[PDB]
């Protein structure tokens, strides 16, 4: 039973098992309007389970042979990947510099933050304030004592 | 606030001028009378060497304290950038190898779609 | 000159007000409010962790 | 010239001996206090391992304006830090979309090989 | 050759309000001290 669980978890999905989406049949309909793109779209909707689930009889030995075969088909290869990675990095820095529709989403993201954060701030503040306004008065009324302990000091030194 | 020899709150603090540390006068005096030395560093010290103006001060609170605060802000935010510079160099490195395996594989999808259809085109005609 | 005239130089009264559906200018001003509010909420976390112990020690 | 943590010009630089890299004393110490490691090579390093290793003063120009400069520079750095983090999340996000297509494609090859295998049997008959 | 200051609960203000007050308090004191 331990062996069977080891076979199902590994052969469940490569992306899902490793690490990190909303359901969109209209996005799959819009993207098609080419065949390989539709195959990955249905694959994403199946694993995730306006969303219907269905595909559950497709996804270990057939995948290993498929991976070994594709590896055979694939210094010079290392430089062509480093050059393309720099080109995509320049395209990512260019798409970011132009922005700084889209502006309304960021403001609403802040309104969530402003809400979530400032509510936390006000709770952290009022919790602190209750404990620390007393200690502020304690600390601040002590500071006033230095200002009188100093002013007398000088008059005594002067008179001395 | 503490005396380094005893560990008590010293009621007559006198700071030495060889190993800079606040000692209690009555304690350090006896240490000097035992042997002319500073207890911490064992450097020579006499009783006259030990020491108990006009500008008025105010307590250390949240200009200089404000400037050292802004160092903490920026020095912490500079490490925040490393967390995203280092993590970017892993993602882009995995993306580069991922897109290369995608580009190396899709040529084989294009040939199998040719070969499986060519085998259907060949066989059905016969 | 500041003391004689009795006038302090004006600081950035901008972050507090802002406005939604603005432009590229308020897109920046909005993104400013987020990062500083996250810094704020992180700046309140390390205070509350110690809490009153750090205050009473001073 | 540049400490490889912040991007500043270091005013008390210190070099790590596990990996040849001149860091700044303040920043390397915080990292070691978090976890005993080197930020670049992830090798086991300590504070005593560090060996303490140009200063040209900025003369801005010919004070109330300098207040608003420092305001603008913090205002700019806050956005230059923000822009660089949303880009990291979306490059990882677009990377995850590639991984699904990568593994989805190699399942579609298995069916295509079956159609080729079925064809090779029929051709022989 | 340690001191603790408890950074206020409402700690924007450090850039705007706190820093402004510090250079006001430095300015109007030394001017008043020059008067003295």
Swiss-Prot record, chain A:
Compartments in which it is found: Cytoplasm; Nucleus
Interaction with PRP19 and self-interaction: annotated span: 91-109
Chain's role: Involved in pre-mRNA splicing and cell cycle control. Required for the binding of the NTC complex (or PRP19-associated complex) components to the spliceosome to mediate conformational rearrangement or to stabilize the structure of the spliceosome after U4 snRNA dissociation, which leads to spliceosome maturation. Its absence leads to an arrest of the cell cycle, possibly due to the inefficient splicing of TUB1.
Assembly description: Belongs to the NTC complex (or PRP19-associated complex), composed of at least CEF1, CLF1, ISY1, NTC20, SNT309, SYF1, SYF2, and PRP19.
Other remarks on this protein: Present with 784 molecules/cell in log phase SD medium.
Family listed: Belongs to the CEF1 family.
Name listed for the protein in its UniProt record: Pre-mRNA-splicing factor CEF1
Annotated source species: Saccharomyces cerevisiae (strain ATCC 204508 / S288c)
Phylogenetic classification of the source organism: Eukaryota, Fungi, Dikarya, Ascomycota, Saccharomycotina
From Swiss-Prot, chain C:
Record carries keyword Magnesium: no
GO biological process: mRNA splicing, via spliceosome
Disulfide bridges in this chain: none
Coiled coil: none
GO terms for cellular component: Prp19 complex; U2-type catalytic step 1 spliceosome
The protein's assembly and partners: Belongs to the NTC complex (or PRP19-associated complex), composed of at least CEF1, CLF1, ISY1, NTC20, SNT309, SYF1, SYF2, and PRP19.
Name this protein carries in UniProt: Pre-mRNA-splicing factor SNT309
Organism per entry: Saccharomyces cerevisiae (strain ATCC 204508 / S288c) (Baker's yeast)
Swiss-Prot record, chain E:
Subcellular location as annotated: Nucleus
Domain of life of the native organism: Eukaryota
Disulfide pattern: none
Note: Present with 11700 molecules/cell in log phase SD medium. The tetramer is an elongated particle consisting of four globular WD40 domains held together by a central stalk.
General function of this protein: Probable ubiquitin-protein ligase involved in pre-mRNA splicing. Acts as a central component of the NTC complex (or PRP19-associated complex) that associates to the spliceosome to mediate conformational rearrangement or to stabilize the structure of the spliceosome after U4 snRNA dissociation, which leads to spliceosome maturation. It is also probably involved in DNA repair.
Entry similarity comment: Belongs to the WD repeat PRP19 family.
Subunit structure: Homotetramer. Component of the NTC complex (or PRP19-associated complex), composed of at least CEF1, CLF1, ISY1, NTC20, SNT309, SYF1, SYF2, and PRP19.
Name of the protein in its database record: Pre-mRNA-processing factor 19
């Amino acid at each position: 039973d331990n062996e069977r669980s080891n076979i199902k978890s590994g052969k469940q999905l490569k992306s899902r098992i490793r690490k990190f989406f909303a359901s969109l049949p209209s996005p799959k309909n819009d993207f098609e309007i080419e065949d390989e793109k539709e195959e990955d779209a249905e694959i994403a909707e199946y694993e995730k389970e306006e969303d219907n689930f269905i595909e559950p009889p497709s996804q270990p030995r057939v995948s290993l042979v498929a991976v070994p075969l594709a590896y055979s088909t694939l210094k010079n290869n290392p430089q062509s990947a480093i050059d393309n990675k720099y080109n995509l990095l320049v395209a990512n820095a260019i798409n970011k510099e132009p922005h700084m529709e889209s502006r309304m989403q960021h403001i609403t993201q802040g309104r969530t933050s402003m809400k979530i954060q400032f509510k936390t701030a006000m709770p952290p503040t009022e919790v602190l304030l209750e404990s620390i306004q007393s200690k502020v008065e304690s600390i601040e009324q002590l500071q006033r004592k230095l200002q009188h302990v100093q002013p007398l000091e000088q008059q005594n030194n002067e008179m001395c | 606030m503490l005396c380094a020899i005893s560990g008590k709150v010293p009621r007559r603090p006198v700071l030495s001028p060889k190993s800079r540390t606040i000692f209690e006068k009555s304690l350090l005096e006896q240490y000097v009378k035992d042997t002319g030395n500073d207890p911490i560093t064992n450097e020579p010290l006499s009783i006259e060497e030990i020491v108990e103006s006009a500008q008025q001060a105010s307590l250390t609170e949240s200009i200089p304290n404000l400037l050292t605060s802004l160092q903490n802000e920026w020095d912490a935010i500079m490490l925040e950038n490393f967390k995203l510079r280092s993590t970017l160099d892993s993602l882009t490195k995995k993306l580069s190898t991922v897109m290369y395996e995608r580009d190396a594989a899709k040529l084989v999808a294009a040939q199998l779609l040719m070969e499986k259809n060519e085998d259907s085109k060949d066989l059905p005609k016969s | 000159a500041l003391y004689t005239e009795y006038l302090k130089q004006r600081n950035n009264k901008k972050r507090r007000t802002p406005d939604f559906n603005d432009d590229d200018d308020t897109l920046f001003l909005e993104e400013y409010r987020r990062k500083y509010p996250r810094i704020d909420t992180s700046r309140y976390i390390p205070n509350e962790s110690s809490e009153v112990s750090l205050l009473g020690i001073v």
